[PDB]
C-alpha cells in the first residue's frame, strides 16, 4: 500500500505556524503535499458569527467584572464546541482511511493547521487557568477527544516569551491579552511534558500523591507536577475524602491514552520564515508514516483536504 | 475469551425506563448482570449545579421572551456537555475492552442511556425547541464515539397520552412539565428508529437529499430531514461540505447499531419481562482480556455508587 504522512502544526497562536506551513507546502509539487488550513470561515461565519471576537470579548468583560464566572463559562464552553467542529469532522472522515504505521517517500503528505486537541484540550485548559471555564467542562472535552490515529505527528513551537509578545503585539476579533498568552504557552509546555512523561512510562495514578504544593522526543521523565495532570487537582474535582472523583479519574485515563501514542516534535520559531520552513522540513525526516486502507484512499484524502481548504480557509 | 452483552436502555424520558430496568436488574445474579444507572449526582452536583433545573429554566425564559434564542443556545450547548460527560467517559474507558461479535454471556451490562442521547437526541430536540443551533447539533454528532460491535439499544413505544401521564408523575429535580419538549423528544426518537432502518436497508442520504426539496422509510421521515436547516446551507441552497461530512459520520455511527423496541404501555413487571424477552435477539461480543470482565464490573458499580441517586 502507498504511504501517508500526516503532520499537525500546533501550539500557541502568534508564533508563525501558518506562514511556516505555507512555505513548506510551497516546496512540493502540487499534489504530493496538501494543506488543511485554519477553518477561519467556519469560525467567523458558517458555525456561528465571529466566534474569536465572542471569545475575546467574553474574557474582557469577565476581567472587567461586567459578567460572572458562570456566564463566561457557558459562553466559552459553547464557543469551544464551535471552534473544534471542523477538526473533529475531519478526523472522523479521515479515520477509516488510515492503516498501520509504516522508509521511501510518502505518496502523500497532509499538513494540518492544528490537531483536535487544540480545541478539545489546550484552549479549554487555558481558559480554565483564565477563570472562564470550569475544570469539569475541560474534562468533558477531554473525554470526547477522538481515538488517536496511527502516525499522529504533532509539531509544537518554541519561542522566547519576549519575542512571542512582540510578534503578537503587531499582527479575527482578537484582543492583546498577555495573561491568555502566558496561559496557552504554559498549557502547550505542559502538553509536551505530558507526552514525554507517558512515553517514559509515567503512571499518573501512581504519581498523583506527588502533587500538592520543555521537550518531547528527548530528555528524562518529567515530574507529574510539570504535566497536564497538575491542572486537575482542583477542589471542584475532589471528594470530601480528598481523592479525585472516579468520573474525573477516568477522564484522566482517557487523557493518558490519547496523548501517549502521539509523536511530538518541537520546532524553534525564533528565526526567519525561510529558516522555520527548512527546520520543519528537516524535522519531517524523523516522522512516522502510515499505510492507507484502500487504493483510492490517496486521491480521496486529497479531495477532502482541498474541499476543506476551499470552503473553510480564508 | 468470555462474552459480554451490552444493553443501552434509551428513548424519551418519562416512559418508565428507570423503574423497568431496576426490576430487571433484580432478577439476575448479583454479578452476572450489572446496571449502570442514571448519573443524576453528576448532573445535580459533580459536573455543575442542578443542570436539569438550568436546562428547563432556560427554555422557559426563552418561551417567555425573557432571553434571546442566542442566549438560550449557549446555555443549552454548555449544559449538554455536562449532561453527556458520564456517558462519554464510560464509553471511552470501556471501548478497549470490547472485542468482535461472538450461549449465555459471562456478563450482561445494562446502561441507563447511550451517548447518542446527549450527543444527538436531546440536542436535536432542543434545536426543534428553538434553543440550540443546528451547527452545534452537528458538532455533537461529529464527536459521537465510533460504534463498537454489539451496540444494542432499546427504545420505547408508548402512546402520547399515557406518556404524558407517566411523565407528570415522575418529574426530575428542576424539571418542568413541557408538552412541547415531550413532543420534540418523542419525534426525534421516532426519527432515530426510522433512520437506523433507512440506513440498514441501504439508504444513501446524499442520493436521496434532493427529495427533501422535491423498501425503506422516506428520508423525510429520518433525522436527515432536520439538517435541511437554512443555517447549514450556502446561498445556492447546497449543504456546506463540513455539515455534509458530519451527516456522513451520523450515517456511519447509526447503521451498525442494533435497535429493539420496548412497549412501555404495560405494567412495570410486564415491561421487565418484555425487556428480558428482547435479549435473545441482541448481539454479544467477546472481551479483549481475561481481566476485562472484572474490570467492567468494577467500573459499573463504581459509576453507580458515585453518580447514581
Ligand atoms: C484553536 C483555538 C484557537 C486558535 C486561534 C488561532 O490560532 C485563535 O485564537 N483559539 C481559541 O480561543 N480556541 C481554540 O480552540
Ligand atoms: C440525557 C438527557 C436528558 C435525560 C434525562 C432523563 O433521562 C434527564 O433530564 N435530558 C436532557 O435535557 N439532556 C440529556 O442529554
Swiss-Prot record, chain A:
Transmembrane residue ranges: none
- EC supergroup of this enzyme: transferase
The way this protein is applied in practice is:
Used in molecular biology as a selectable marker to identify transfected eukaryotic cells. Used in cancer suicide gene therapy to selectively kill transformed cells.
Binding annotation for ATP: 11-18, 167
Q: What is its EC number?
A: 2.7.1.21
Sorted UniProt keywords: ATP-binding, DNA synthesis, Early protein, Kinase, Nucleotide-binding, Transferase
Give the positions the UniProt entry annotates as the active site. 38
Task: Spell out the reaction equation it catalyses.
Answer: thymidine + ATP = dTMP + ADP + H(+)
Database matches in InterPro entries? Herpes_TK, P-loop_NTPase
What is one Gene Ontology biological process annotated in the Swiss-Prot or TrEMBL record? TMP biosynthetic process
State the SUPFAM superfamilies in the record: P-loop containing nucleoside triphosphate hydrolases
Tell me which residues bind substrate: 56, 80
Remarks, miscellaneous: Phosphorylates and thereby activates certain drugs like acyclovir (ACV), valacyclovir, and famciclovir to a toxic form, that leads to successful suppression of the infection, while the uninfected cell does not have this ability because it lacks TK. Mutations in thymidine kinase may induce HSV resistance to antiviral therapies in immunocompromised patients. The most frequently observed resistant strains are unable to express TK and are avirulent in animal models of disease.
The record describes the protein's role as: Catalyzes the transfer of the gamma-phospho group of ATP to thymidine to generate dTMP in the salvage pathway of pyrimidine synthesis. The dTMP serves as a substrate for DNA polymerase during viral DNA replication. Allows the virus to be reactivated and to grow in non-proliferative cells lacking a high concentration of phosphorylated nucleic acid precursors.
Name the UniProt record assigns to this protein: Thymidine kinase
Naturally occurring in which organism (per UniProt): Human herpesvirus 1 (strain 17)
Upper taxonomic classification of the species? Viruses, Duplodnaviria, Heunggongvirae, Peploviricota, Herviviricetes
Gene that this sequence comes from: TK
Swiss-Prot record, chain B:
Q: What class of enzyme is it?
A: transferase
Free-text biotechnology note from the record: Used in molecular biology as a selectable marker to identify transfected eukaryotic cells. Used in cancer suicide gene therapy to selectively kill transformed cells.
Say what the protein does: Catalyzes the transfer of the gamma-phospho group of ATP to thymidine to generate dTMP in the salvage pathway of pyrimidine synthesis. The dTMP serves as a substrate for DNA polymerase during viral DNA replication. Allows the virus to be reactivated and to grow in non-proliferative cells lacking a high concentration of phosphorylated nucleic acid precursors.
Gene from which this protein is expressed: TK
Which residues are recorded as binding substrate? 56, 80, 172
The protein's GO terms of the molecular function aspect are: ATP binding; thymidine kinase activity
Assembly, in brief, is:
Homodimer.
Q: What is this protein called?
A: Thymidine kinase
Q: Which residues form the active site?
A: 38 (proton acceptor)
Q: Give the species.
A: Human herpesvirus 1 (strain 17)
Which additional comment does the entry carry?
Phosphorylates and thereby activates certain drugs like acyclovir (ACV), valacyclovir, and famciclovir to a toxic form, that leads to successful suppression of the infection, while the uninfected cell does not have this ability because it lacks TK. Mutations in thymidine kinase may induce HSV resistance to antiviral therapies in immunocompromised patients. The most frequently observed resistant strains are unable to express TK and are avirulent in animal models of disease.
Show the catalytic activity: thymidine + ATP = dTMP + ADP + H(+)
Amino acid at each position: 500500500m502507498p504511504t501517508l504522512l500526516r503532520v499537525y502544526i500546533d501550539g500557541p497562536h502568534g508564533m508563525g505556524k501558518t506562514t511556516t506551513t505555507q512555505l513548506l507546502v510551497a516546496l512540493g509539487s502540487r499534489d504530493d503535499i496538501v494543506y488543511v488550513p485554519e477553518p477561519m470561515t467556519y469560525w467567523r461565519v458558517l458555525g456561528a458569527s465571529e466566534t474569536i471576537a465572542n471569545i475575546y470579548t467574553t474574557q474582557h468583560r469577565l476581567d472587567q467584572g461586567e459578567i460572572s464566572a458562570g456566564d463566561a463559562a457557558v459562553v466559552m464552553t459553547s464557543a469551544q464546541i464551535t471552534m473544534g467542529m471542523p477538526y473533529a469532522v475531519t478526523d472522523a472522515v479521515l479515520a477509516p482511511h488510515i492503516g498501520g504505521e509504516a522508509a521511501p517517500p510518502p505518496a502523500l503528505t497532509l499538513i494540518f493547521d492544528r490537531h483536535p486537541i487544540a480545541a478539545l484540550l489546550c484552549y479549554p485548559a487555558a481558559r480554565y487557568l483564565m477563570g472562564s471555564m470550569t475544570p469539569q467542562a475541560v474534562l468533558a472535552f477531554v473525554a470526547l477527544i477522538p481515538p488517536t490515529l496511527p502516525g499522529t505527528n504533532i509539531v509544537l513551537g518554541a519561542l522566547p516569551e519576549d519575542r512571542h509578545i512582540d510578534r503578537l503585539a503587531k499582527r479575527p476579533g482578537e484582543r492583546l491579552d498577555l495573561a491568555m498568552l502566558a496561559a496557552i504557552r504554559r498549557v502547550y509546555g505542559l502538553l509536551a511534558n505530558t507526552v514525554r512523561y507517558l512515553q517514559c512510562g509515567g503512571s499518573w495514578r501512581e504519581d498523583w500523591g506527588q502533587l500538592s504544593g520543555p521537550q518531547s522526543n528527548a530528555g528524562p521523565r518529567p515530574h507529574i507536577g510539570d504535566t497536564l495532570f497538575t491542572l486537575f487537582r482542583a477542589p471542584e474535582l475532589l471528594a470530601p475524602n480528598g481523592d479525585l472523583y472516579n468520573v474525573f479519574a477516568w477522564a484522566l485515563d482517557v487523557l493518558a491514552k490519547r496523548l501517549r501514542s502521539m509523536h511530538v516534535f518541537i520546532l524553534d520559531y525564533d528565526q526567519s520564515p525561510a529558516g522555520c520552513r527548512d527546520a520543519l522540513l528537516q524535522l519531517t525526516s524523523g516522522m512516522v508514516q502510515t499505510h492507507v486502507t484502500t487504493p483510492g484512499s490517496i486521491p480521496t484524502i486529497c479531495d477532502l483536504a482541498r474541499t476543506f481548504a476551499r470552503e473553510m480557509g480564508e
